[PDB]
Design a protein around this ligand. Structure first.
Ligand SMILES: O=C1N=CCc2cc(NC(=O)[C@@H]3CNC[C@H]3c3ccc(Cl)cc3)c(Cl)cc21
Lengths: 396, 383
């Protein structure tokens, strides 16, 4: 008998659970949204409903972590679907990074399921290689993800403010080789590696920060996707031959992007850069060929033997099997850090921060709020809030 | 009004069963959506499908932990009403024995009103009185609402009248049970022997409340539709086409009368007449002779509203000579022993209840209707 009443409470507390405390609220909350347009109030049932809750709900909405609870500093970042912000928690004066996503856009645009994989990970990954999620929540307009601010900055920027020396390269490349094995180990392929997505903390050490692609591999390391993902200059061959329906790839693809990282980093441009993106397509599939190099050998035998081992055909890429083989590769041989400690050592660059909110590594932005799209008032039920039902996550 | 602040204010709402948003309420809404959406006709909506994707199965498991009606062993239909029926049953798990009335979510919508059960639930469950039947559990599914209440082997007080030191006892208890209600801020609006039940110890409680209405701070109510049973309804409730608790006493007189007499003090071959009967309470009031105290009570309740025993202060009804006695006292009446005691064979003796023998089911929708929305929050696990 008591095989249930016990099994129940788990579900109502387990942050991993789809129906935990804050989840069930999101559903009730959402109803209250997707029904309170008078056009529907014309339904006895619907009316009788809003009557009973409306007010309660409103109060519940005052207690739950609302966007107001945050003080907006400056637009640290912005993307297709939303933007990232630096904020101080107006109560506990804590300072986080808060990414907003557009419930609107994400409906208009074909896909609105990518953020699940992200939240789950950033929040539970628990690893200094992954940025950390502290809170998540929604209104009728946005999803908000509150995260460990990274005073450090993107690595695309560090390559716009330096001329990375091979030693620095080895170090950055190794952290990324590590950061990824983390995600790999959680049964996820990243699927959009690139500087854009590698940030630094107060101590000039790297984590990854967008998971806007992340997909979980099956029991045998693979995935059955069938639409390309990432960024032109990085994506791998497999994920272009992706084109429904033969897409069938594993870990390996995330290493290819690594090659492109390592490349752009020492060189200065992507290994498949093209004045016409459409060209970068051909380039990538000709990796065997297209792979040129600076006629000025300003680089290592070890760096090359690495890169052209990553930027090789999937069937045969460093790491096709075992991360080990990438690690014990010549290029990483050195004596200033060791795999099992790299992060404890001292990053090639350290944050020259003036304060807790030194947004100097981040190129200032205009800061338009609410400007974009607005959901239409419907003539009947559509349930626009239903696929964001469960997003909310408080913890610690 | 502060992070640490509201976050306190929140927990309450999730824990206090009087709250509309308690744990068990939340679920009902999440559960209800899953019902009113799962119809193929709608799953043709991107969002609506993607949604049932994410929950449907989860919820299905949650429906197996929650107190499902399966959890109970059906005994026999001890009761039956227009909107459903009452049943005796043993909790298949902990073999306990309760009285589980069912309501028809279907009929309750087809029938113009579906709000009356809230008063009931609230009362039966929070009353905390020997005077009110108690509610242990409440819950629902796509078809019925269920109320698990303390069984009453005793029986209805109209059945007792088919088998005055006796009447002064019953009438007293009813006078007391009812003051409980009023003090809760409720005016029952449907007294009758049908709604009066007796416990293992021949003591009475009230059982139906699908009528009760909360009086405003002025002890008054602003209704304008008649409810109850014909032979009982009071005059002011018929002219309803604003008042207060006094009308619940009128019924009290109607009980005392039929109790002593044999039939209602406004009976009619054609109920229709009973209407004008009650309106002419002054006249119509006939008489077969028993007590001078009985009479002085009766024709003090069956008086015009503006002047009825208990206009204000129900103590005056108490201090009316009819109650003068020496075998019980107000502040003990229940402790005494009842004029009748349950001669039960066991825990499930449905002897005092006459054994009793459509079946409409909701229409599949061609769009969102939300027929389960008005019963969202019913569910009530109590302790
Ligand atoms: O401190 C941060 N802490 C966590 C995550 C984070 C993420 C980002 N943003 C990005 O990593 C991407 C990469 N290039 C565009 C930028 C971006 C901005 C908004 C969206 Cl919606 C998507 C992507 C920034 Cl800047 C800072 C932080």
């Amino acid at each position: 008998f008591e095989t249930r009443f016990e099994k129940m409470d788990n579900l109502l507390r387990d942050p991993k659970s789809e129906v935990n405390s804050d989840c069930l609220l999101d559903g009730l909350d959402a109803l209250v949204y997707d029904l309170d347009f008078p056009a529907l109030r014309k339904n006895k049932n619907i009316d009788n409903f809003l009557s009973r809750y409306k007010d309660t709900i409103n109060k519940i909405r005052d207690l739950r972590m609302k966007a107001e609870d945050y003080e907006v500093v400056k637009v640290i970042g912005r993307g297709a679907f939303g933007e990232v912000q630096l904020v101080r928690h107006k109560s506990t004066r804590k300072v986080y990074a808060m990414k907003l996503l557009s419930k609107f856009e994400m409906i208009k645009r074909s896909d609105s399921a990518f953020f699940w994989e992200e939240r789950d990970i950033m929040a539970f990954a628990n690893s200094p290689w992954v940025v950390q999620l502290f809170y998540a929540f929604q209104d009728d307009r946005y999803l908000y993800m509150v995260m460990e601010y990274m005073p450090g900055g993107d690595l695309v920027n560090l390559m716009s403010n330096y001329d990375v020396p091979e030693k620095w390269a080895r170090f950055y490349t190794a952290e990324v080789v590590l950061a990824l094995d983390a995600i790999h180990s959680m049964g996820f392929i990243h699927r959009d590696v690139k500087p854009d997505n590698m940030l630094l903390d107060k101590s000039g050490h790297l984590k990854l920060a967008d998971f806007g692609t992340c997909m979980k591999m099956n029991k045998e390391g693979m995935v059955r996707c069938d639409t390309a993902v990432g960024t032109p200059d990085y994506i791998s061959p497999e994920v272009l031959k992706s084109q429904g329906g033969d897409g069938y790839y594993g870990r390996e693809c995330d290493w290819w992007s690594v090659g492109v990282f390592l490349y752009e980093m020492l060189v200065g441009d992507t290994p498949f850069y093209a004045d016409s993106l459409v060209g970068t397509y051909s380039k990538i599939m000709n990796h065997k060929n297209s792979l040129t190099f600076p006629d000025d050998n300003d680089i290592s035998k070890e760096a090359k033997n690495l890169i052209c081992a990553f930027l090789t055909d999937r069937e045969v890429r460093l790491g096709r099997n075992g991360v080990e083989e990438i690690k014990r590769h010549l290029f990483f041989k050195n004596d200033q850090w060791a795999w099992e400690t790299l992060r404890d050592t001292v990053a090639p660059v350290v944050p020259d921060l003036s304060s807790d909110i030194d947004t100097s590594n981040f190129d200032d932005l205009e800061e338009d709020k609410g400007e974009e799209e607005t959901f239409p008032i419907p003539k009947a039920f559509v349930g626009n809030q239903l696929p964001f039902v469960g997003f909310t996550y408080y913890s610690n």
